[PDB]
Write an enzyme that holds these catalytic residues in place. Structure first.
Site, PDB file in Angstrom:
ATOM      1  N   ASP A   1       0.860  -1.172   0.000  1.00  0.00           N
ATOM      2  CA  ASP A   1       0.000   0.000   0.000  1.00  0.00           C
ATOM      3  C   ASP A   1       0.898   1.224   0.000  1.00  0.00           C
ATOM      4  O   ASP A   1       2.111   1.107  -0.210  1.00  0.00           O
ATOM      5  CB  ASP A   1      -0.975  -0.001   1.188  1.00  0.00           C
ATOM      6  CG  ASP A   1      -2.302   0.668   0.855  1.00  0.00           C
ATOM      7  OD1 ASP A   1      -2.335   1.921   0.729  1.00  0.00           O
ATOM      8  OD2 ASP A   1      -3.314  -0.057   0.722  1.00  0.00           O
TER       9      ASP A   1
ATOM     10  N   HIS B   1      -3.262   3.745  -3.732  1.00  0.00           N
ATOM     11  CA  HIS B   1      -2.657   2.944  -2.658  1.00  0.00           C
ATOM     12  C   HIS B   1      -1.244   2.473  -2.995  1.00  0.00           C
ATOM     13  O   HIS B   1      -0.881   1.316  -2.777  1.00  0.00           O
ATOM     14  CB  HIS B   1      -3.573   1.780  -2.274  1.00  0.00           C
ATOM     15  CG  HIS B   1      -4.807   2.218  -1.557  1.00  0.00           C
ATOM     16  ND1 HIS B   1      -5.976   2.529  -2.213  1.00  0.00           N
ATOM     17  CD2 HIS B   1      -5.038   2.449  -0.245  1.00  0.00           C
ATOM     18  CE1 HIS B   1      -6.883   2.911  -1.334  1.00  0.00           C
ATOM     19  NE2 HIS B   1      -6.340   2.872  -0.132  1.00  0.00           N
TER      20      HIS B   1
ATOM     21  N   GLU C   1     -10.626   3.337  -4.515  1.00  0.00           N
ATOM     22  CA  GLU C   1     -10.466   4.746  -4.122  1.00  0.00           C
ATOM     23  C   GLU C   1      -9.477   5.563  -4.967  1.00  0.00           C
ATOM     24  O   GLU C   1      -8.570   6.201  -4.424  1.00  0.00           O
ATOM     25  CB  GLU C   1     -10.093   4.846  -2.629  1.00  0.00           C
ATOM     26  CG  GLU C   1     -11.115   4.230  -1.668  1.00  0.00           C
ATOM     27  CD  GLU C   1     -10.576   4.043  -0.259  1.00  0.00           C
ATOM     28  OE1 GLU C   1      -9.353   3.821  -0.093  1.00  0.00           O
ATOM     29  OE2 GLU C   1     -11.379   4.108   0.694  1.00  0.00           O
TER      30      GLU C   1
HETATM   31  C1  NGT Z   1     -11.270  -1.295  -0.373  1.00  0.00           C
HETATM   32  C2  NGT Z   1     -10.919  -0.386   0.785  1.00  0.00           C
HETATM   33  N1  NGT Z   1      -9.957   0.545   0.741  1.00  0.00           N
HETATM   34  C3  NGT Z   1      -9.815   1.314   2.028  1.00  0.00           C
HETATM   35  C4  NGT Z   1      -8.642   0.717   2.842  1.00  0.00           C
HETATM   36  O1  NGT Z   1      -7.410   1.107   2.244  1.00  0.00           O
HETATM   37  C5  NGT Z   1      -8.669   1.172   4.292  1.00  0.00           C
HETATM   38  O2  NGT Z   1      -7.592   0.534   4.976  1.00  0.00           O
HETATM   39  C6  NGT Z   1     -10.004   0.740   4.887  1.00  0.00           C
HETATM   40  C7  NGT Z   1     -10.077   1.084   6.372  1.00  0.00           C
HETATM   41  O3  NGT Z   1     -11.321   0.614   6.903  1.00  0.00           O
HETATM   42  O4  NGT Z   1     -11.083   1.428   4.213  1.00  0.00           O
HETATM   43  C8  NGT Z   1     -11.187   1.212   2.761  1.00  0.00           C
HETATM   44  S1  NGT Z   1     -11.745  -0.397   2.255  1.00  0.00           S
END
Ligand code: NGT
Ligand code: NGT
Lengths: 572, 572
Positions: free
Chosen positions: B227, B281, B346
């Protein structure tokens, strides 16, 4: 392989930078940077007086640390044990698997105990110390700890151990070169309540808890050893209580085990304070005595706060013979405690009213069967129980009761007095009861449930949803909870505070996570009472968490380690 | 000393009674009572077919258990390892410190693997088994496990181990005398996501996690290995990623360590499924490549969901050379996986829009700079990344993406197809996206955050208060969360579910508590899809918690042990 990064202090934050080879500036490891970039370096709790850490680090030889006790006395064994333990503490700077190079200066640790015979716990005991570190000759270090008692002295040893850092870039063990520290706690009572009746805790886990308490200068282990769910305390005089009451024959606390814990505590400046909760919160163990009422009463919601229900029957004379024996057995093994906790939480009127023998006692003694007449029965019980407590410990000693219907400030003086009874508060820090009690001269131990109940936040243990005092209390909230703010002008009457680990949903497996590192936030609040808030302690809190983990404590994780390595980037 | 109580079944509840000497009725230990008082005894998960446990227990000799493999094949080594591990499993019935008497019957365990060459993980693999236990001759027991594959066979061994009980009144090891069980899981994907990038997890802790997964028949370990916070995966072809990216040189996952975990998984029926999250990420490790944008971008709230920000730059051709290498290195060591997770959670439009090189690429290719044009860039990235993934694994294999802007059912078919992409759902179980996706033929892995996010409930890790998805999800809620209910008629498209342990606030120290026993609730839900609710599984859940603790797992505590010993008295 080798660490690739270095850190540089910028506006109070250690920023991670490439350790590029084409540089004449010596690279700083993360912890080396933090030690001087942070106002209070890596210390926890931060000192209350002088906190001068200078600017430099010296490389030291791990195998060349010598501890010298300059004043001998009755605490010789305790001082020698604390000294032997010091090398072990120093090694906690070194990450597991890493080995420091056995080069550098020798460290002479000089221990000056001003009153070397003093070893009793008391609310008036002197926990102050002075700490000085300076170069000595060409090739050694002079570390001098001066304190009025053993307890102050071992606090000083704790602080001193935190002045060592491992440079993992060079594999050197380092130590702060020039130190001037003066220090003493704001509050004399700095505690953790461990409920070992709702679930059993191995004595290994209890000792480990004391180890972590001592690391952050917490001094009181409040052992809530009995309740309605079990009786693990081995009472020699009333052996059926533990025989019938224990969750199993091995889930017990023998005299030898308790003596071990109590001594382990003493060596580490931790008083082990037993509680026998009465007259509610009894049940298992008392079968066949006819000395309880409502045990396992159904429906439980009509008779108690949580299952199983069960209360002592104060009308039976034999009860106080049992109590005398339990208290005497407790006094025998809990022989460092200066205080006795007698519980007094959550007494059910409905439970007492459902008993024929109790009703007959009240009607014959001219009392009614209304809500306030049961308060007369409670007083009757507590007075007689109190008498037995004094007899057991062979002296009048301070007694603790929880806030309850009995301790309502409006009528508390009818039943108790401020000299004999300390009140443990588990109302919100804003509840009117606190000021009312303080204005009547009462001394308080703060365990307000909105900030200090470490059990809150998990799933329901009866039905579904979450447990009663949810949400989970973050360290930020326990840090900002100030007894000085709660009590104002009457703050000298606050003896301190206590984090409560009730154990409906905690045991051996979970206690490291439940307590750590959150109890360290209480530890600083009670030691230093900082005017500053949690954000100002955030970086040092992240470090103390890592130190607990190095100790072998399965501490809760607070933040990504990336945040610890990259100060300032994680904020909201 | 000796246990003082006995238990008797009354209306499906084991009631604790005095073991009084003046009785001709044989006293039952707690577990012996539970085995026959409970509908499904001490089994977890409960079987889906035949579940006949009979009425009796037989005393067995621990040192007289012999396992016989009747059909040899390519899985010989796996079957032999699983067999060797069986005695160890049986000993988990015996509490630590207790010793059974070495008397009683010998147990012959017969393993019949119908297809002894089959050892590949696949969504179509056969995890069914038959289990029969019956007396054999005068002095022995015949336990026969019959399964279509090794995986079904080792599930059968797991169930069989749960049919042993320690009588701690008599110190006898007991075994259910007459058993007829047929069993197979409702869902083929039964997983746990472990984020090992937000914090590091020791490989010991990862293996221990797999041990507990196998105990409740979970079969998929989703290793979220990279990540923005760290890159612990040792990629031999792009060594700077882990060199710059790791939290420390020792906080790494070498090829040898991953091979160990992958094999440890295989022996226990657990597929180890790697994730490389892209194109968001990412961050640490990518320094000096110019292949990311927004790394550590401030203020972070404008550019990402959580610090540090950082995204891949899809416009650079060299990126896909890096990706090809990472995926190939992953494919080499993660060589049991049949599926690859590519993240896709995300993605920030603002982050991509802040880059000059990215803006120039879009304007020259006739795309605008509005919100929907960045979805074209995302598709461009994913298509090229996908190509490299197939090349790395040497075949087309199913790929997983999270629910996101990209996977919005309304436009998902523009970018993806249902045959090539499995969607991992982390919306609420009631979100319109689920039905929309199912109606378009998509296959789902259920990780709905309101029931399956195991990180929720703790303190804030940025600022104060509690973390984003609080409150803490109790096992009761994870148990009642039904994919069959969520998906209705399209339930065959649900491949299963996955408990998500994101690690902003979890590491080596906390993973036992985070996962256990809550992941066991998911394990039964996915194995059996019971029409009954959590209350009907409550007693067996309390037992499986104790079994995890006996395994050395620091499992969360659910209820006072008193409740476990006194069924029916703890309710709301
Ligand atoms: C798919 C997801 N991506 C995120 C993660 O990177 C976080 O760690 C998590 C914390 O609850 O929330 C959302 S879930
Ligand atoms: C004093 C108190 N008595 C009760 C305890 O017995 C429970 O264990 C605790 C759970 O939070 O709640 C209150 S605090």
């Amino acid at each position: 392989e080798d660490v690739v990064w270095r850190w540089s202090c910028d506006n109070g934050k250690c920023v991670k930078l490439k350790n590029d080879p084409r540089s004449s500036e010596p690279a700083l490891s993360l912890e080396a940077c933090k030690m001087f970039c942070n106002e209070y370096g890596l210390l926890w709790p931060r000192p209350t007086g002088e906190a001068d850490l200078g600017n430099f680090l010296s490389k030291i030889n791990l195998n060349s640390i010598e501890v010298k006790i300059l004043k001998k006395g009755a605490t010789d064994d305790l001082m020698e044990a604390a000294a032997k333990r010091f090398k072990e503490q120093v090694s906690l700077a070194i990450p597991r698997g890493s080995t420091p190079k056995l080069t550098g200066k020798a460290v002479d640790v000089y221990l000056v105990n001003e009153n070397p015979n003093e070893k009793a716990f008391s609310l008036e005991m002197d926990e102050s110390y002075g700490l000085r570190v300076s170069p000595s000759g060409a090739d050694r270090v002079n570390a001098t700890i001066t304190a009025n008692s053993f307890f102050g002295m071992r606090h000083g040893l704790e602080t001193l151990s935190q002045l060592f850092v491992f440079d993992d870039i060079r594999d050197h063990l380092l130590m702060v070169r020039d130190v001037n520290i003066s220090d003493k706690p704001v509050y004399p009572y700095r505690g953790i309540l461990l409920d070992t009746a709702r679930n059993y805790y191995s004595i290994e886990s209890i000792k480990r808890t004391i180890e972590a308490m001592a690391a952050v200068k917490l001094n009181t282990f409040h052992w809530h050893i009995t309740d309605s769910q079990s009786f693990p305390f081995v009472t020699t005089k009333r052996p059926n209580l533990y025989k019938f009451g224990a969750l199993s024959p091995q889930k017990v606390y023998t005299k030898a085990a308790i003596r071990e814990v109590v001594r382990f505590g003493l060596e580490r400046g931790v008083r082990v304070l037993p509680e026998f909760d009465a007259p509610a919160h009894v049940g298992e163990g008392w079968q066949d005595t006819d000395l309880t009422v409502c045990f396992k009463a159904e429906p439980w919601k009509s008779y108690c706060v949580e299952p199983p229900c069960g209360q002592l029957n104060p009308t039976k004379d034999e009860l106080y013979q049992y109590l005398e024996d339990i208290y005497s057995d407790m006094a025998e093994v809990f022989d460092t405690t200066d205080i006795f906790h007698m519980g007094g939480d959550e007494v059910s009127e409905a439970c007492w009213n459902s008993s024929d023998s109790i009703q007959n006692f009240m009607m014959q003694n001219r009392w009614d069967l209304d809500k306030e007449s049961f308060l007369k029965l409670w007083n009757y019980f507590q007075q007689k129980a109190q008498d037995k407590a004094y007899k057991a410990f062979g002296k009048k000693l301070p007694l603790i009761l929880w806030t309850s219907t009995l301790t309502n400030y409006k009528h508390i003086d009818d039943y108790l007095n401020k000299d004999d009874y300390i009140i443990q508060v588990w109302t919100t820090g804003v509840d009117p009861q606190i000021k009312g009690l303080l204005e009547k001269g009462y001394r308080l131990i703060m365990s307000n449930y909105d900030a200090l109940y470490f059990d809150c936040g998990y799933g329901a243990w009866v039905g579904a949803g979450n447990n009663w005092c949810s949400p989970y209390i973050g360290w930020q909230k326990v840090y900002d909870n100030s007894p000085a703010v709660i009590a104002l002008e009457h703050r000298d009457q606050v003896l301190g505070g206590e984090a409560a680990l009730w154990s409906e949903q905690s045991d051996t497996s979970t206690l490291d996570g439940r307590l750590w590192p959150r109890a360290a936030a209480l530890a600083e609040r009670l030691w230093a009472e900082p005017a500053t808030s949690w954000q100002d302690a955030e970086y040092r809190m992240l470090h103390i968490r890592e130190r607990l983990v190095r100790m072998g404590i399965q501490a809760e994780s607070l933040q990504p380690e990336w945040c610890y390595q990259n100060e300032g980037y994680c904020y909201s």
